[PDB]
Structures are given as structure tokens and as C-alpha cells.
């Protein structure tokens, strides 16, 4: 029975980044600015961030009267019209909506057009403590939150592939994914846009499975609780020890479910999300027990 904290949305007049501040160097200006259209449909109104995979816009769509909509690069033959069908029929309240797929000569690469979630990511809750690390019992209750949309991506046989706080945004009382594009079928070919540091080794040897978004739980779940050894801009493999973690002595259960969930070998790791489910109940509890 976890209560999430409620989180504020931010009005709307503070949703856009400032074009007239300097960038830090090394970032281009957006190719879209306000006033451009897209598709003849979407009416580009600013950017919120800029990515990896390049700027992230908000648009009207002119389709529905109030829409506000997110622009976000989709990443690079028949099958690919029904793996953006597929997208477009993910039908879960934790997971973000997409509504349709475009293409634009300014853009390379196309977007996909996606519901916008107003609230900020758990990385963002993360920087907002004096040390960047949440609470364990309320980073847990994240997880806890964010497993039913995992577990619905699993049973219709796909992976979300991508977990990491950055793409949790936490609005009100829930959470919702963000990184679409990201999912793929379990064991599907091609290359799987996972960020090193959080995805389990075997994915770009076997490919994606339910094993190893549950790696990814894992590696979340740990970079929400406690500062991680950096290696090459890569966060290393491995949980810290507890000889080095007083956090990790103090909650041994904790480091033992952490251990299990990004263990090596995928045959040792949880089989399911209600497997993880399960420990992570009983996790909080002894946290709960020791803290209080
Ligand atoms: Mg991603």
C-alpha cells in the first residue's frame, strides 16, 4: 500500500526552454522554432530538452480540439508498419500514449508523436537531494508504481528495453514511461537502443527478454538509492559492496534483491515482475522495520 507523494504539475508557462539563453557549447539550435508546421498537423510551439537523439518538441495537433502533443526522433521493411501499429495499440495508464508517426525533410529520422506528461522524471527528483539520491523506502515505491505498465508490456510479449530514471516522469500520484520508442519484442533482432550502464549484458548477444528488463529494474532502482561508481561516462557494472555501502549494511535484504536483479546470468535473476513484485514487498517491510 505505497502513497506516492503528490507532485505539482509546472504551469504551462514554464514548460518550454528559453531561446534566448546561451547553450552550453558543443549544442546546435533547434531546427524547429514556434510557428512551423509539421505534417500539416502539428503546430511546433518550443522544445522542453534536448536528448541524446536531439531536441524534444511540443506541438498542437489540430486533429483534436487542446491537444498538446510531444515530437520526440524516432530512431532508425514491412514490419516496421506493424511495429508502429503495434505502439499506437499500447493501452496502459502507465505508459505513455503514442499517437502517430511522421516524417519532416528539417528532421532526419521522423518522430513519433506522443502524449505529453507534465511532471519531472525521477533524475530530476534525484538532483533535488543534497547527495542526488532518494529515500530507499520511497525510491521502492517508485518501482513498486511503475511495475504494473512493465508487467502489461511483458504479457502482450514485448520489453521496454530503455528503464532508467530519466524516462519516469512522476505526475500527481503515479508514474508514467516515456521511452516508447524503445520498445521492442522479446527476442527481437537488431540493434536494442538500451543505455549502457543500466542494460543487461546478454541483450546484445541474445537479445531482449523479461530477464533483462528486469536488469534494468534493478540498475534503476540502485541509481535511485545510492551514488554509483563511473567508469569511462558508463556506470559500472556490479552493486557496491556493503563492506563500502552503510546504506547497504544497514539494509542487507535490499542488496541481496539488487544483487539477484541484475545478476550475470539470467537464469538467476527474478523470472517475472510478480516475482519481483513479491521481494520487494518484503524488502520494504524489513526497511521499514529497521528504520522505524
Ligand atoms: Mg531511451
Redesign the pocket.
Known amino acids: 500500500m505505497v502513497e506516492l507523494p503528490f507532485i505539482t504539475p509546472k504551469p504551462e508557462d514554464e514548460l518550454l526552454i528559453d531561446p534566448e539563453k546561451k547553450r552550453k557549447p558543443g549544442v546546435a539550435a533547434p531546427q524547429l522554432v514556434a510557428g512551423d508546421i509539421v505534417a500539416e498537423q502539428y503546430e511546433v510551439l518550443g522544445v522542453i530538452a534536448h536528448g541524446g537523439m536531439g531536441w524534444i518538441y511540443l506541438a498542437n495537433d489540430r486533429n483534436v480540439s487542446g491537444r498538446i502533443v510531444v515530437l520526440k526522433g524516432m530512431m532508425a521493411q514491412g514490419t516496421a508498419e506493424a511495429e508502429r501499429e503495434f505502439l499506437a495499440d499500447i493501452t496502459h495508464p502507465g505508459i505513455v500514449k503514442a499517437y502517430n508517426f511522421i516524417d519532416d525533410p528539417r528532421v532526419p529520422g521522423g518522430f513519433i508523436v506522443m502524449e505529453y506528461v507534465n511532471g519531472p522524471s525521477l533524475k530530476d527528483r534525484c538532483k533535488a537531494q543534497p547527495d542526488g539520491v532518494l529515500r530507499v523506502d520511497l525510491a521502492i515505491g517508485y518501482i513498486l508504481e511503475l511495475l504494473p505498465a512493465m508487467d502489461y508490456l511483458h504479457q502482450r510479449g514485448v520489453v521496454y528495453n ?1 528503464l532508467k530514471p530519466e ?1 519516469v516522469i512522476a505526475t500527481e500520484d503515479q508514474v508514467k514511461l516515456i ?1 516508447l ?2 520498445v521492442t519484442g522479446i527476442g527481437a533482432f537488431g540493434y536494442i ?1 538500451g ?1 549502457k550502464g543500466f542494460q543487461a549484458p546478454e541483450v546484445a548477444t541474445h537479445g531482449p527478454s523479461i530477464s533483462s528488463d528486469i536488469f534494468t529494474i534493478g540498475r534503476t532502482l540502485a541509481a535511485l538509492t545510492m551514488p554509483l561508481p563511473v567508469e569511462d561516462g558508463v556506470l559500472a557494472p556490479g552493486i557496491p559492496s556493503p563492506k563500502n555501502s552503510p546504506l547497504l549494511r544497514r539494509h542487507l535484504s535490499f542488496y541481496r534483491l539488487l544483487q539477484r536483479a541484475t545478476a550475470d546470468d539470467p537464469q538467476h535473476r527474478f523470472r517475472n515482475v510478480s516475482e519481483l513484485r513479491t521481494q520487494l514487498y518484503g524488502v520494504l517491510r524489513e526497511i521499514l522495520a529497521v528504520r522505524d
Open positions: 530503455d524516462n521511452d520508442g524503445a537502443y543505455t
